[PDB]
Design a binder for these strands. Structure first.
Ligand SMILES: [Mg+2]
Ligand SMILES: [Mg+2]
Ligand SMILES: [Mg+2]
Ligand SMILES: [Mg+2]
Ligand SMILES: [Mg+2]
Ligand SMILES: [Mg+2]
Ligand SMILES: [Mg+2]
Ligand SMILES: [Mg+2]
Ligand SMILES: [Mg+2]
Ligand SMILES: [Mg+2]
Ligand SMILES: [Mg+2]
Ligand SMILES: [Zn+2]
Ligand SMILES: [Zn+2]
Lengths: 136, 87, 131, 94, 386, 150
RNA sequence: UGUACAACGGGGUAUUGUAAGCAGUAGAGUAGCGUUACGAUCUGCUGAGAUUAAGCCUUUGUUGUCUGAUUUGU
RNA sequence: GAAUGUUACCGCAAUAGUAAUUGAACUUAGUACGAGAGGAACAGUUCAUUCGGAUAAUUGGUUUUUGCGGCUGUCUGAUCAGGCAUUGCCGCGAAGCUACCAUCCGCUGGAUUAUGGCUGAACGCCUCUAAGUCAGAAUCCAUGCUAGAACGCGGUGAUUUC
RNA sequence: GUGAACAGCCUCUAGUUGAUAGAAUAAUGUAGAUAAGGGAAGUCGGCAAAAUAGAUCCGUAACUUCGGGAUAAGGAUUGGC
């Protein structure tokens, strides 16, 4: 379930297939992230790899700093607009899809995250929880 | 990964199975048997309360009907030559 | 369910909420910040000509003036009049945190309300003078 | 960890969190706290001196009952006459 | 030549043929292994599937992310009134398998189980077992001889029971009759148990208890004739493909000059016999309990029946079994509940279930209230109430 | 485990029911039904939709301020568990609900007084304004009574 | 010829969103002489009114129905 | 689906098919090992990938329920109540169907391969092999699952008054 | 009548009510629709659908044979009383 993730992950509804564009919620200068791959994705004919909340993806920066663009970096999904079920008994969703730029060990490039962060992602990644100001 | 038919996993499963899982199964079986006996006793008590207001050789053939039917069947099989064991 | 409502009120095409706009209009500092915006190349009109009530950018001051002389803007202004209807109102209607709802209502009636009205009046006269 | 290892081990031992409760009575540690009652949450009704508050409510209710909070003929008309009027109006509407 | 990209085949070849089941009551193909040391016990039970609802469970599972937390789970309700013991069958072992040697019936049978022997009950003279009942006279010779034969020769003992379908809300009056294997002491002990239990009822809590894993055996819901796309899960062909897109494009391109049995074809979907295993019993509810839908956390005096009743079924007025998840079959279908064939070695088989809440909102719509009293309390006074 | 109130219509939201939406300012919006959720997405006004508790309270259809309505509020300062306090709370909740129902009934009766007077005046005016149909009614009743007599 | 069956009716359970009719002093104004006339709309009677098995649950009510044809033997 | 007296209920199982798969996590443990840098596994536990079989409590989708409400144009003198617009259009919408867009479930006995052995000749040494024999792979045959020979079978009930 | 309009839709005069029918509502079709999240990852190829659309006002680039391009583009609005 990825390197740097703390523990196991239970299944979440998949919202972001390959080719999706999500907002960047950190302060590293990127404006949006373009998903090109999903870490830990399965193998099945014709099936697109898809990401969910708390998943690590490989993303290129489409809008942002010119020095920041034209390279592939790991990212962690912190918000999705597709509704998913919490085991406490409610389906819930956010307004947008959003992620943060991280390293293969799961450490944030930026120093803070703007906007709410999903509880699943915050509990899975200790550095996201350290940099998060709003957790749900 | 180790398959469902993996020998060492099955051996470890048997070692675990002989212990607490079998003990819990035995305790549940004893409780269920006690409840079944209680249910039979309660039905007996209700039947007694209802009646308060109101008040070996196994050889040979089973019966004559069975004797007649089986003898006719064997005679028919012999006549039509459709027997499995007898020429 | 139908296509018109689906493609207007998709989650990715959502607009700013009325209680957020009311909070923006309540304080004079927020109104000043929204009137004096930094130049953004990604916004219509370089981030200028922003209607606070409708939370909408215009490409030009003449477009902002035509928007102000319209029924859609009047509809939003009429919507932004009374209590903002937060979750406390629904809780009080169900019978939950009634005293908190009453305190919020009297605070809106006494302090937040007239200040927001005066800020709206100053914004209206500023827009009329500059446009 | 010694208790866990002697009982079940890691991932098998089920610790009782209520053993550390500092209550008035130790018999209350293994008590199930109710949460729902007839569509209401118990926790937002739970409060000390709720007995005194309910007593004040009961006094107010008795005052209302004494005041009379919970408790066919018109000017120039009798009961039979108004029944006849109602019956004829129902006939006319039908 | 070889296929360029590997992919698993569509469908399971072990569930063939996908034909309609022979009977609406699914057959029990295997019973648990008999242990002669254990006391006498039934190996299965009969119920009627009523519907599904929702629970909240306080989870105690060490090592889990949801340890010491609440989870919302779906459960299935099976109406299980007591069954009636009406017969016993003895089975001997032969080089050709198990063979039934003889069957002994009880003296008195009810009309519920007599209707199982008739296609036209209202026109019949109702003569079934009327001469068999005469063999119980003058000390029951014949009956005793057949019981002695079962004691002497049988290696397997099964008890014939029938459902009390009059206690359910079902419109059907004909009862269901089935064989349940007896696992317990010696053959003589099994025969004595069956004889003493003739014309007696067995309740579901004298077969199962809470926190036990059971198996559900039933015929699935029928769907009629179906195309390959939904029968086997094949991919749809592109838009406006000639002769249809809900097909397999090429059913054969290779030498055998036949259609292979392993190629997806259109046909019957549903109404198949299925046996699913390891369903945990969440509650064994008693029908005479006024609050069998209440928990220690939820103090509302209510039964298991939702507002308006179960859709297409009705109320639950008897004992019931609440198991988690889903089981094959649809509402009001007869189901067989079987004991586990092995000693399960998972911790979920040893977990103790504590329920915090049981959903009783209406299943006939977006139900918002658990009780009619709650609905009246929320809405207030209506025009017709004054 | 908790019963929530719908953001749109104040109906109870039981576990596993409805849907929640989280905004950018960490505000949760719970809806008991897809109906309320879609109304919120369309940005309709629950104080303008008549089937909502917000509208009913605003318009005075049911009582909104009472002593029995001040016993429920969010408790942000917990108290230590006490068995007798729990029992007292469990009895008090039933008593409070019974009293609140009595007062709601009284409020509705006070709101609906005068309907009998209005209906009687309408019936009297109709009877005064329709003389010919009353004559037809009298003829029909007299013929029926004659038929019963003979 | 009955915990009989059916067609209606009743009660629940749901869906929508406040029926027709009447009234008001609420209604931007305008016209004639404070009043009257017109007036989108608003408010009250009114969670009203309508629908609810056709594959929902239930039923002390009303009205009826219970019958023809074919074949089968060791 | 005819036929072997008729009719009904409960069963047996020849044969045919067969199904599960992979990764990660806690603990073992910063332990064995190691100047260091680094760093395992068995036993005990928890999730997930792919596949398969179901299921509709909840969420989402779907609407001729033409169920409720609304809109444009026209028509029935107006109100009311309605017609038509090739399902007129818009919002909600039960029931049903359905989704890795929802939820649940998917095992355990014998015999073996490579290989490691025991006893032991051939060959007065020796040798796992010659006779004999112990273990051992996701393998094989079974257990379990699906169908049930329409010319395989058993047990049991009733068997006609013109 | 609506409407710029011999457009589309509804109606009066006049004229038709013709085209084998009945019962059910499986698969596959022919014709027509809707769909969460993503948005061409599909495909040889955005094929097909979707999106745009009337009218009023603001505004409108390169190039040019100076006539055009042009409804360029891009914006604000529309009911009733
Ligand atoms: Mg492909
Ligand atoms: Mg499926
Ligand atoms: Mg339902
Ligand atoms: Mg291990
Ligand atoms: Mg019209
Ligand atoms: Mg040797
Ligand atoms: Mg056969
Ligand atoms: Mg879509
Ligand atoms: Mg491509
Ligand atoms: Mg491709
Ligand atoms: Mg051009
Ligand atoms: Zn505006
Ligand atoms: Zn709601």
């Amino acid at each position: 379930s990825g390197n740097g993730a703390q523990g196991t992950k239970f299944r979440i509804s998949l919202g972001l297939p390959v080719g999706a564009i999500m907002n960047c919620a950190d302060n590293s200068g990127a404006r949006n992230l373009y998903i090109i791959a999903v870490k830990g994705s399965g193998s099945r004919l014709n099936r697109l790899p898809a990401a969910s909340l708390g998943d690590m993806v490989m993303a290129t920066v489409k809008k942002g700093k010119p020095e920041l663009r034209k390279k592939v970096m790991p990212a962690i999904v912190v918000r999705q607009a597709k509704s998913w079920r919490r085991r406490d008994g409610v389906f819930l969703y956010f307004e947008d899809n959003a992620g943060v730029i991280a390293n293969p060990k799961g450490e944030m490039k930026g120093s803070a995250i703007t906007g709410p962060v999903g509880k699943e992602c915050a509990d899975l990644w200790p550095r996201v929880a350290s940099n998060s100001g709003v957790v749900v | 990964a180790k398959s469902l038919r993996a020998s060492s996993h099955l051996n470890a499963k048997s070692v675990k199975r002989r212990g607490v899982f079998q003990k819990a199964v035995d305790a549940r079986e004893q409780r269920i048997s006690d409840k079944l006996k209680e249910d039979l006793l309660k039905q007996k008590l209700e039947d007694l309360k209802k009646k308060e207001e109101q008040g070996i050789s196994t050889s040979g053939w089973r019966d004559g009907r069975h004797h007649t039917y089986k003898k006719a069947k064997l005679m028919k099989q012999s006549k039509k030559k459709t027997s499995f064991t007898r020429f | 369910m139908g296509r018109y409502s689906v493609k207007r009120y998709k989650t990715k095409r959502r607009t700013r909420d009325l209680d957020l706009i009311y909070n923006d209009l309540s304080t004079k500092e927020s109104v000043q910040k929204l009137l004096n915006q930094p130049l953004d190349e990604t916004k219509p009109g370089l981030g200028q000509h922003y209607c606070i009530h409708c939370a909408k950018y215009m490409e030009t001051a003449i477009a902002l003036k035509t928007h102000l002389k319209g029924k859609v803007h009047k509809r939003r202004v009429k919507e932004l009049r009374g209590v903002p209807y937060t979750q406390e109102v629904s809780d009080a209607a169900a019978g939950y945190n009634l005293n908190k709802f009453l305190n919020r209502v009297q605070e809106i009636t006494q302090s937040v309300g007239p200040e927001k009205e005066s800020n709206e009046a100053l914004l209206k006269e500023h827009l009329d003078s500059t446009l | 960890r010694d208790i866990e290892a002697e009982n079940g081990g890691a991932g098998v031992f089920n610790v009782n969190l209520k053993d550390k409760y500092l209550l008035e009575d130790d018999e209350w540690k293994n008590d199930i706290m109710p949460e729902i009652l007839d569509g209401k949450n118990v926790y937002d009704f739970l409060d000390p001196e709720i007995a005194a508050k309910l007593q004040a409510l009961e006094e107010e209710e008795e005052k209302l009952e004494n005041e009379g909070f919970y408790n066919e003929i018109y000017d120039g008309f009798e009961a039979s006459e108004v029944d006849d009027i109602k019956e004829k109006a129902a006939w006319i509407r039908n | 030549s070889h296929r360029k990209y590997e992919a698993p085949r569509h469908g399971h070849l072990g569930f063939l043929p996908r034909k309609r089941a022979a009977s609406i009551r699914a057959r029990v193909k295997a019973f648990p292994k008999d242990d002669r040391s254990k006391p006498v016990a039934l190996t299965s039970f009969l119920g009627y599937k009523a519907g599904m609802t929702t629970i909240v469970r306080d989870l105690d599972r060490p090592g889990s992310k949801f340890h010491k937390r609440e989870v919302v789970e779906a459960v299935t309700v099976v109406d299980t009134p007591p069954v009636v013991v009406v017969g016993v069958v003895g089975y001997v072992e032969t080089p050709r398998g198990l063979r039934s040697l003889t069957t002994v019936w009880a003296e008195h049978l009810s009309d519920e189980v007599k209707r199982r022997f008739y296609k036209n009950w209202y026109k019949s003279k109702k003569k079934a077992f009327t001469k068999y009942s005469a063999k119980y006279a003058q000390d029951g010779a014949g009956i005793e001889r057949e019981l002695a034969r079962i004691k002497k020769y049988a290696s397997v003992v099964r008890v014939l029971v029938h459902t009390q379908i009059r206690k359910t809300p079902l419109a059907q009056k004909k009862a269901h009759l089935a064989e349940i294997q007896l696992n317990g002491g010696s053959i003589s002990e099994k025969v004595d148990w069956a004889r003493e239990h003739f014309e007696k009822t067995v309740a579901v809590d004298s077969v199962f208890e809470q926190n036990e894993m059971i198996d559900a055996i039933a015929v699935t819901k029928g769907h009629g004739f179906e195309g390959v796309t939904h029968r086997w899960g094949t991919k749809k062909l592109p838009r406006k493909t000639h002769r249809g897109l809900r097909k397999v494009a090429c059913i054969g391109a290779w030498h055998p000059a036949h259609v292979m049995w392993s190629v997806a074809r259109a046909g019957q979907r549903g109404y198949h016999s299925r046996t699913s295993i390891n369903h945990k019993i969440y509650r064994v509810g008693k029908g005479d309990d006024e609050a069998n839908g209440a928990t220690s956390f939820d103090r509302t005096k209510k039964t298991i029946t939702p507002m308006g009743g179960f859709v297409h079924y009705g109320e639950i007025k008897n004992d019931f079994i609440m198991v988690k998840g889903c089981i094959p079959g649809n509402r009001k279908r007869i189901v067989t509940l079987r004991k586990s064939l092995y000693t399960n070695t998972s911790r979920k088989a040893l977990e103790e279930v504590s329920l915090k809440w049981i959903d009783t909102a209406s299943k006939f719509g977006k139900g918002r209230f658990q009780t009619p009293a709650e609905k009246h309390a929320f809405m207030g006074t209506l025009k017709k109430d004054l | 485990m908790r019963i929530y109130q719908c953001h749109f219509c104040s109906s109870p939201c039981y576990p596993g029911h409805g849907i929640m939406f989280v905004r950018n300012d960490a505000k949760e919006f719970r809806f008991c039904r897809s109906k309320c959720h879609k109304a919120f997405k369309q940005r309709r006004n629950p104080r303008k939709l008549k089937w909502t508790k917000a509208f009913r309270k605003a318009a005075g259809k049911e009582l909104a301020v009472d002593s029995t309505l001040t016993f429920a509020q969010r408790r942000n300062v917990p108290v230590r568990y006490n068995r007798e306090l729990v029992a007292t709370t469990l009895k008090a909740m039933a008593r409070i609900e019974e009293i609140r129902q009595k007062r709601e009934r009284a409020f509705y009766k006070n709101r609906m007084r005068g309907n009998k007077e209005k209906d009687f005046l309408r019936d009297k005016k109709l009877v005064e304004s329709n003389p010919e149909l009353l004559r037809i009614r009298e003829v029909e009743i007299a013929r029926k009574l004659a038929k019963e007599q003979e």
